[PDB]
């Protein structure tokens, strides 16, 4: 095949490499990922008032998206501009979470372009807001049989609340010309009002916990990204592996004498990655690419006979009438202690001839 | 075939996504042409069009230029579905809302 002919005359030939070694692909990643405090906002039992919503900042952690799927028997979730499924793989450099409790009938008011008492006096959502909104019933934990009045919502304000604004002023709203001066009465009503959360009340009046998530993209290194899945680790036997993106193929042994703890890779004279440290176990294991091919073949001319002998170049005779030479390993020929004239050179003063095939 | 606006970006070699994994896959060495034009006037009605369907769930991706018409109940868990919808038992193909 290599010689592009159907007949090859006597002499050594350096044949090419053939056959297929399939192997398989694996991937590793650093052991353990620092989870973002999602449950510190959701799994927390107590919430603040809608007019005094909780605002939390998240940074320097991984954000797993699997726990949120198990949050309530039925929760309403919607993002503006970003599809549900493709939220995990995105990378964000800032994210902000606002959480509060509202009335079920006014949940739809928490949306861009919406109006109402809450949308103008408690929390305004900007029209161009990108991010997500999650809402779910909380009548079990935010209502008691005696009419809990802890949560409260604003009712009166001089101006409509701006997007991303927090108003917690408790000053008496003046509904007339005469001043209030801190005295309740006519034309002077308390801007703060509290719902009546009761288990017997309708779902419209039943409390609903609402959390909005806003993605902030500052010119800084990212801090909110999806988790990285780590596959298994095949060792010893020559396989392909991919560590953090870089490739390798072959055996895995130590290359460590004084490997610096902070060092990660190790290059040879070719500036090619040979030694790599596994993120898990942090042990060191080199590559030594396998799948060697290019054996040599010694044969007389086909016009004469058909037998051949193989010569593996520079390989020990236990890594594959077997004979061992300085040049490599010889298979298919028998060594003779006699002496003759050189016919087919091999190397290191060894010559082969066809009398079967003999080497001397 | 009829497709959902955005999707057009999937019909191209090397692209991924639902249509490009369970419904219609192009080989990497493809040669030819692609014509795509909006048809909101005809294929969409204010009365609701639901004769156009697309597969959503499949165990494995398709080879290039492959067609699947099996309507067996998808299995998402260890328990068999026995041809009945339920938990971990969803109809593989969804519908297309055109308005």
């Amino acid at each position: 095949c290599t010689l592009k002919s159907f007949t090859v005359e006597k002499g050594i030939y350096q044949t090419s490499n053939f056959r297929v070694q399939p192997t398989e692909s694996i991937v590793r990643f650093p052991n353990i990922t620092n989870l973002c405090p999602f449950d510190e906002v959701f799994n927390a039992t107590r919430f603040a008032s809608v007019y005094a919503w909780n605002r939390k900042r998240i940074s320097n952690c991984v954000a797993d998206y699997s726990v949120l799927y198990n949050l309530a028997p039925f929760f309403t979730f919607k993002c503006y501009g970003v599809s549900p499924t493709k939220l995990n793989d995105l990378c964000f450099t800032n994210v902000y979470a606002d959480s509060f409790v509202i009335r079920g009938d006014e949940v739809r008011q928490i949306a861009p372009g919406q109006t109402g008492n809450i949308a103008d006096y408690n929390y305004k959502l900007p029209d161009d807001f990108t991010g997500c909104v999650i809402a779910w019933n909380s009548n079990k934990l935010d209502s008691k049989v005696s009419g809990n009045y802890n949560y409260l919502y604003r009712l009166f304000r001089k101006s409509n609340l701006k997007p991303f604004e927090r108003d917690i002023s408790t000053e008496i709203y003046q509904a007339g010309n005469k001043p209030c001066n801190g005295v309740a009465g006519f034309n002077c009503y308390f801007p703060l009002r509290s719902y009546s959360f009761r288990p017997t009340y309708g779902v419209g009046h039943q409390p609903y916990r609402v959390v909005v998530l806003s993605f902030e993209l500052l010119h800084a290194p990212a801090t909110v990204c999806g988790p990285k899945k780590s596959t298994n680790l095949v060792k010893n036997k020559c396989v392909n592996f991919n560590f953090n993106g870089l490739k390798g193929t072959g055996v895995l042994t130590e290359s460590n004498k004084k490997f610096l703890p902070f060092q990660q890779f190790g290059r040879d004279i070719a500036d090619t990655t040979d030694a790599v440290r596994d993120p898990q176990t942090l042990e060191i294991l080199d590559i030594t690419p396998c799948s060697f091919g290019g054996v040599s073949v010694i044969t007389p001319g086909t016009n004469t006979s058909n037998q051949v002998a193989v010569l593996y170049q520079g390989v020990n005779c236990t890594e594959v009438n077997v004979f061992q030479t300085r040049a490599g390993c010889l298979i298919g020929a028998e060594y003779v202690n006699n002496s003759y004239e050189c016919d087919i050179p091999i190397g290191a003063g060894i010559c082969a001839s066809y009398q079967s095939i003999i080497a001397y | 075939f009829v497709i959902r606006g955005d999707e057009v970006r999937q019909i191209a070699p090397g692209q991924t996504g639902n249509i490009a994994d369970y419904n219609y896959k192009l080989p990497d060495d493809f040669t030819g042409c692609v014509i795509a034009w909006n048809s909101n006037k005809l294929d969409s009605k204010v009365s609701g069009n639901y004769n156009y369907l697309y597969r959503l769930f499949r165990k494995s991706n398709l080879k290039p230029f492959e067609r699947d018409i099996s309507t067996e109940i998808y299995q998402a868990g260890n328990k068999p579905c026995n041809g009945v919808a339920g938990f971990n038992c969803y109809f593989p193909l969804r519908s297309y809302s055109f308005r």
Partner: nanobody
Amino acid sequence: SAVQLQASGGGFVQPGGSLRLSCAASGWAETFGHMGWFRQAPGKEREFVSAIDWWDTVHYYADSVKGRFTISRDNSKNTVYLQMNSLRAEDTATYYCAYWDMDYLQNSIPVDYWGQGTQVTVSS
């Protein structure tokens, strides 16, 4: 959106009797989509039966069943109920629990999910 619907009730009854059907919704959706029931007969098409909202504010019944079928929403367990009374022979068919994911139901045409068929037979 991922909504799973479960249907409960049905069976064999007599004309003029009473019955209770129910549907429960689980998972997540775009908004507080309304809930309804449809009825399909063997050899015929599906027929709109009843539609209610997520807060018991809008009631919609088909003209042929106006004032006879009733639909209600519970307050604490998320399960919608369909109260049925004074059945006749034309009510023997398979009911389905239909969900539509939007805030205002202009028409019953846009359907995203269905429910398990519940067989309701009315005979002597």
